[PDB]
Design a protein around this motif. Structure first.
Motif, PDB file in Angstrom:
ATOM      1  N   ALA D 139       0.817  -1.127  -0.232  1.00  0.00           N
ATOM      2  CA  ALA D 139      -0.049  -0.103  -0.222  1.00  0.00           C
ATOM      3  C   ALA D 139       0.718   1.092  -0.031  1.00  0.00           C
ATOM      4  O   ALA D 139       0.601   2.254  -0.736  1.00  0.00           O
ATOM      5  CB  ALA D 139      -0.919  -0.034   1.310  1.00  0.00           C
ATOM      6  N   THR D 140       1.855   1.251   0.828  1.00  0.00           N
ATOM      7  CA  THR D 140       2.538   2.462   0.982  1.00  0.00           C
ATOM      8  C   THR D 140       3.766   2.766  -0.227  1.00  0.00           C
ATOM      9  O   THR D 140       4.182   3.711  -0.599  1.00  0.00           O
ATOM     10  CB  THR D 140       3.493   2.423   2.124  1.00  0.00           C
ATOM     11  N   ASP D 142       3.103   1.596  -3.134  1.00  0.00           N
ATOM     12  CA  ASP D 142       2.033   1.924  -4.437  1.00  0.00           C
ATOM     13  C   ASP D 142       2.044   3.407  -4.859  1.00  0.00           C
ATOM     14  O   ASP D 142       1.778   4.244  -4.225  1.00  0.00           O
ATOM     15  CB  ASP D 142       0.646   1.474  -4.079  1.00  0.00           C
ATOM     16  N   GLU D 143       2.714   3.623  -6.023  1.00  0.00           N
ATOM     17  CA  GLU D 143       2.751   4.687  -6.665  1.00  0.00           C
ATOM     18  C   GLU D 143       1.517   5.512  -6.970  1.00  0.00           C
ATOM     19  O   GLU D 143       1.592   6.621  -6.962  1.00  0.00           O
ATOM     20  CB  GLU D 143       3.576   4.733  -7.775  1.00  0.00           C
ATOM     21  N   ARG D 144       0.420   4.681  -7.115  1.00  0.00           N
ATOM     22  CA  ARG D 144      -0.823   5.192  -7.559  1.00  0.00           C
ATOM     23  C   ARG D 144      -1.491   5.772  -6.315  1.00  0.00           C
ATOM     24  O   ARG D 144      -2.776   6.080  -6.494  1.00  0.00           O
ATOM     25  CB  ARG D 144      -1.689   3.876  -7.903  1.00  0.00           C
ATOM     26  N   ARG D 145      -0.904   6.162  -5.345  1.00  0.00           N
ATOM     27  CA  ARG D 145      -1.637   6.786  -3.935  1.00  0.00           C
ATOM     28  C   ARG D 145      -0.875   7.687  -3.133  1.00  0.00           C
ATOM     29  O   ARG D 145       0.329   7.968  -3.144  1.00  0.00           O
ATOM     30  CB  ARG D 145      -2.271   5.508  -3.131  1.00  0.00           C
ATOM     31  N   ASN D 146      -1.958   8.264  -2.485  1.00  0.00           N
ATOM     32  CA  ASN D 146      -1.386   9.461  -1.338  1.00  0.00           C
ATOM     33  C   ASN D 146      -0.299  10.460  -1.582  1.00  0.00           C
ATOM     34  O   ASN D 146       0.655   9.994  -2.216  1.00  0.00           O
ATOM     35  CB  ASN D 146      -1.104   8.911   0.004  1.00  0.00           C
ATOM     36  N   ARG D 148      -0.397  12.207   1.319  1.00  0.00           N
ATOM     37  CA  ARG D 148      -0.477  12.683   2.617  1.00  0.00           C
ATOM     38  C   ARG D 148       0.295  11.206   3.208  1.00  0.00           C
ATOM     39  O   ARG D 148      -0.114  10.724   4.300  1.00  0.00           O
ATOM     40  CB  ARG D 148      -1.906  12.705   3.036  1.00  0.00           C
ATOM     41  N   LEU D 149       1.110  10.620   2.627  1.00  0.00           N
ATOM     42  CA  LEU D 149       1.848   9.357   3.040  1.00  0.00           C
ATOM     43  C   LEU D 149       2.528   9.529   3.984  1.00  0.00           C
ATOM     44  O   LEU D 149       2.878   8.746   5.128  1.00  0.00           O
ATOM     45  CB  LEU D 149       2.406   8.718   2.182  1.00  0.00           C
ATOM     46  N   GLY D 150       3.348  10.610   4.085  1.00  0.00           N
ATOM     47  CA  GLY D 150       4.322  10.918   5.138  1.00  0.00           C
ATOM     48  C   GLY D 150       5.692   9.953   4.581  1.00  0.00           C
ATOM     49  O   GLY D 150       5.997   9.798   3.454  1.00  0.00           O
ATOM     50  N   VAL D 152       7.185   6.555   4.166  1.00  0.00           N
ATOM     51  CA  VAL D 152       6.790   5.181   4.111  1.00  0.00           C
ATOM     52  C   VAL D 152       7.837   4.326   4.611  1.00  0.00           C
ATOM     53  O   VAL D 152       7.384   3.260   5.171  1.00  0.00           O
ATOM     54  CB  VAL D 152       6.626   4.819   2.446  1.00  0.00           C
ATOM     55  N   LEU D 214      -1.619  -4.205  -9.364  1.00  0.00           N
ATOM     56  CA  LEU D 214      -1.615  -2.961  -9.936  1.00  0.00           C
ATOM     57  C   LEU D 214      -2.937  -2.726 -10.983  1.00  0.00           C
ATOM     58  O   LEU D 214      -2.702  -1.385 -11.594  1.00  0.00           O
ATOM     59  CB  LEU D 214       0.010  -2.600 -10.361  1.00  0.00           C
ATOM     60  N   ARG D 218      -4.698   1.182 -12.794  1.00  0.00           N
ATOM     61  CA  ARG D 218      -3.487   0.949 -13.773  1.00  0.00           C
ATOM     62  C   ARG D 218      -2.392   2.015 -13.679  1.00  0.00           C
ATOM     63  O   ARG D 218      -2.384   2.963 -12.736  1.00  0.00           O
ATOM     64  CB  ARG D 218      -3.868   0.252 -15.110  1.00  0.00           C
ATOM     65  N   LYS D 220       0.732   3.650 -13.998  1.00  0.00           N
ATOM     66  CA  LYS D 220       2.107   3.772 -13.829  1.00  0.00           C
ATOM     67  C   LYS D 220       2.971   2.368 -13.855  1.00  0.00           C
ATOM     68  O   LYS D 220       3.847   2.431 -14.570  1.00  0.00           O
ATOM     69  CB  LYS D 220       2.836   4.811 -12.757  1.00  0.00           C
ATOM     70  N   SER D 221       1.918   1.357 -13.649  1.00  0.00           N
ATOM     71  CA  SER D 221       2.309  -0.023 -13.668  1.00  0.00           C
ATOM     72  C   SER D 221       2.553  -0.332 -15.149  1.00  0.00           C
ATOM     73  O   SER D 221       3.226  -1.288 -15.630  1.00  0.00           O
ATOM     74  CB  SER D 221       1.502  -0.937 -13.051  1.00  0.00           C
TER      75      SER D 221
END
Ligand SMILES: [Ca+2]
Ligand SMILES: [Ca+2]
Ligand SMILES: [Ca+2]
Ligand SMILES: [Ca+2]
Ligand SMILES: [Ca+2]
Ligand SMILES: [Ca+2]
Ligand SMILES: [Ca+2]
Ligand SMILES: [Ca+2]
Lengths: 143, 233, 233, 233, 233, 143
Positions: D139-140, D142-146, D148-150, D152, D214, D218, D220-221
């Motif tokens: 999850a962290t 994963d380039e497809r998100r957040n 606001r991850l801070g 990882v 991914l 999809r 960037k995968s």
């Protein structure tokens, strides 16, 4: 000739002290009477950002340079209209609330329309939801 | 402006409520300190996330004072902030008392000096505690820096934790007049209380100074201030 | 340049003042270690947030040395940095002594080897401690990477904490000549002090090397950028 | 590719060296667990910051396996990664042994089951530990998100800490074949070792699955993979 | 929508499984609290990173309720979320029971009031715990703020930790109906259970209110945007 | 007629199996012989990003569409030259290494020149440090 009276009293409101200049010192006094106590240095920075002399003394005509020409360059009314056209994507004399949010979001500040709406209908003359030239000067010259 | 005042009020109530609440009991210091240091730190980090964007999350008279002499707020906001923080703290301490069993209440985690620590030494300690604290606040709140800051709420909170990890053994770590005041006025005990106003205030002043000003590298303190003229002109 | 020197001076005073201060006392290691590890870690994370944008927050001769052999600073800055850090530490240790009750003062948290640990083993430990530490600093300070770094100040601080969580039992964890020096020169005790200069320095050197004299990629990195280019075509 | 292999090798040595080192001794679990949980967590967060941008910082066969069945790496890299991680761990355990005093060495923090925990229960525990762990990694990473991850690196590290805070009482928390292997092959003790390969591997597999793929935003995968064709075409 | 429901289900199972699991045993509170507070906090921070982008990671009926009255989700999602969270918790508690040795099982970390704490006081405590918690969630989830937030998953997790650091001594800290329910329905003990639904729910409601019915700034915020507009003219 | 032999063997290198198509299945085989085992789904996504039929079967001419026209739109050679001019700030037929880094950094990826230099002098014909049209096609058609 109503603009010549409006551009008198919209300066008189800040020049109670008669010498014909808005100085950095009175930019300190108005804030001090309003129960602040600024740093004094960053009164020079915000004024020399526009000031034609570089001087920190914004005399009767140079205050109208600061609100209607906004540079150190004598007749920048057309540079206000090309600074409108840097924000526009058409140039129709009118900066939309949407066009203002487009150029602000282009710097990556992901903000909302509702906190630009609190600063167009602070002075909007025609009600339309864009900002014309004379409205932009009067929206920095409320009287 | 009044939303921010409410923010400072609720955050101070929560801050004191949870900080004091987690401090109830004893120990020699070992895990007691770690736990109380973390509680305060996390209470602050939590509250700075909660209302930092609304009022700057001062929740501390000394911190607000720091921002005043730092010329980042008006004399009016500062006083209202401190008023909100003082009443906020007292309330949190109050609500804490009301829901906590006696015997466990003790002196409501009243900031206290260590027998072998003179009030002068304790005041210097409180000064250093608040100094590194305020310095961290100014540096992390500073818009002119970092994109690698991470959470400034946590930074500030962990700074508070650090202050406790070191200071609790000496003075129970006040670092916040309001937080010291609340336990004081409710237990009718102001012995050495002067330490908890003077240290943080001086430390806060030194931190603001040591860091200041918003020149170099200037720019956004000039821009965030020309619209304070345009909203007043 | 002189603001940065002042940064390194104050940060080292604060670093040592709070680190040493939180280390005063004893234990077998259990919660003592956790607490001291966190104090140093949070003291660093705090100071790196406070002055990292101003001087890079080295607050450590070994770290500065690492940056020298890494060719990221001049021979002039390095020496001035170390001078500021050494005097900074001594002062913090001094101010610490002045406000701390005797009996609690002990040897001012002087870095010390464990009886069953040879000075050679202790030097290898100090090397690994500083090595992972410096490696974390270089990697996190590296402008060529991550947008998912979070706070590099915390990363670095937690790296220091890790060094302590492991090292304290062996050598009390020096990882910083200046931090070891301060307690040393004020207690007039340099027994095994060589360990606390040599280990960090060598470890710092190995970290700087391991990271940039790995040498760099190339080809997979390029493919991951042609990927974002066709992610736009 | 070989820089990444070196990354995985050094990170595994450091990971095991510091993790095992901080685990030497005993306790019932109380502060022992907190300390060891934090050490491993911070060792990982540190190493993920240190080499996460270079190799993805797997430092764990089970994690690499997770990424294999997740189709994010080649069968070739995976095996080289695990080889580097296994030798890396053994070395760290080795270097640890060499610098640690006997008596304190114990069984080098060999992963061990609790008497009242069956090997079947212990394997399910190890599965859940690695499952939440891998799930956090996927999850962290994963380039497809957040945005606001801070950090990882910290997220992943704290996930590892969580695994220990819970698991140590049951199985000493392996969550990493390589980390369990190292202590095993050096103490010539493979009692219940099967638990420490099977649990993490299955847990890692379930996490990769539970999360995957991914798909279906999809993007960037797909672009990260058209360049893997263009570098092969 | 169904992926999110699965997210809430698995996250609740993991949350309860690890939270309860790490709570098994006793103590007076000292390091027990710190450890359990961290376990829950890190379990949440982990899960919020894991599925926060997929379902918002509520893993808490009270939190979901907060979002309902906050008008951020449909009455349909809310109920499905709570259903998933309740079954999720029960399962995690179940799987926990199945892999944990008796004697250590106790009452599966059933939320319980302290003898000297009235149910009314305990309900007010649970309210404040959930209130600061939800307030942190709303503020950190709020898209309208911060670029200095860092990880919102950690913020939220540390808020939960704070709730425990304070609350465990009073009520064992529920802050989550589902987390209290699971231990309850499996041990057939609903003594004082009302506290663990009412407090969080009311606290969650007050937090949602306090934040969005504060209602928003406005005018200082507007002048802070005209400041960035003249920061570009 | 040398391009007609180069555009034969630069397809024959991937069509050892004679049927006159590059399929998603052989995009799996080449990666499997190179000791990978991809997901199969994201072979369709990367190809339908260009594929004129939508079909996942890139026949003898459609492989040359995929390398020299790069759309589903018959004669996109001029759309390659306007896709050059979206990246350029002049349009001189040549994308500089600097212009490539300008448009990449415009998405906020703060990267370096040294990891674009490796994907120009992987095939650069004239040595110059920009990328022309025939160089861009051959830098996706190495033989
Ligand atoms: Ca005048
Ligand atoms: Ca003039
Ligand atoms: Ca327009
Ligand atoms: Ca208008
Ligand atoms: Ca074929
Ligand atoms: Ca076709
Ligand atoms: Ca060009
Ligand atoms: Ca060329």
């Amino acid at each position: 000739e109503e603009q010549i009276a409006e551009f008198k009293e919209a300066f008189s409101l800040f020049d109670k002290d008669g010498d014909g200049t808005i100085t950095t010192k009175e930019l300190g006094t108005v804030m001090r009477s309003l129960g602040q106590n600024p740093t004094e240095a960053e009164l020079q920075d915000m004024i020399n950002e526009v000031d034609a002399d570089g001087n920190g003394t914004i005399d009767f005509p140079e205050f109208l340079t600061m609100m209607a020409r906004k540079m150190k360059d004598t007749d920048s009314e057309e540079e206000i209209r090309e600074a409108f056209r840097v924000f526009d994507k058409d140039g129709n004399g009118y900066i939309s609330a949407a066009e203002l949010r487009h150029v602000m979001t282009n710097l990556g500040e992901k903000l909302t329309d509702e906190e630009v709406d609190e600063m167009i209908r602070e002075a909007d003359i025609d009600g339309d939801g864009q900002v014309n030239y004379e409205e932009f000067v009067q929206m920095m010259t409320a009287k | 402006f009044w939303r921010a005042i409410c923010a400072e009020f609720f955050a101070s109530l929560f801050y004191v409520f949870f900080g004091l609440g987690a401090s109830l009991r004893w120990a020699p210091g070992p895990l007691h300190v770690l736990q109380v240091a973390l509680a305060f730190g996390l209470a602050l980090a939590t509250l700075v996330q909660a209302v930092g964007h609304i009022s700057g999350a001062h929740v501390n008279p000394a911190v607000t004072f720091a921002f005043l002499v730092g010329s980042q707020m008006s004399l009016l906001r500062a006083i209202c902030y401190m008023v909100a923080q003082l009443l906020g703290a007292v309330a949190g301490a109050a609500v804490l008392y009301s829901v906590t069993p006696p015997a466990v209440r003790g002196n409501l985690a009243l900031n206290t000096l260590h027998p072998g620590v003179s009030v002068g030494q304790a005041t210097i300690v409180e000064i250093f505690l608040t100094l590194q604290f305020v310095l961290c606040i100014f540096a992390t709140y500073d818009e002119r820096r970092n994109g690698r800051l991470g959470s400034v709420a946590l930074a500030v909170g962990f700074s508070l934790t650090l202050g406790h990890l070191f200071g609790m053994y000496y003075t129970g770590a006040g670092m916040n007049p309001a937080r010291s005041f609340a336990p004081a006025i409710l237990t009718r005990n102001f012995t050495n209380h002067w330490v908890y106003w003077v240290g943080p205030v001086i430390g806060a002043g030194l931190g603001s100074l040591l860091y200041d000003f918003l020149l170099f590298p200037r720019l956004k303190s000039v821009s965030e201030r020309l619209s304070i003229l345009k909203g007043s002109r």
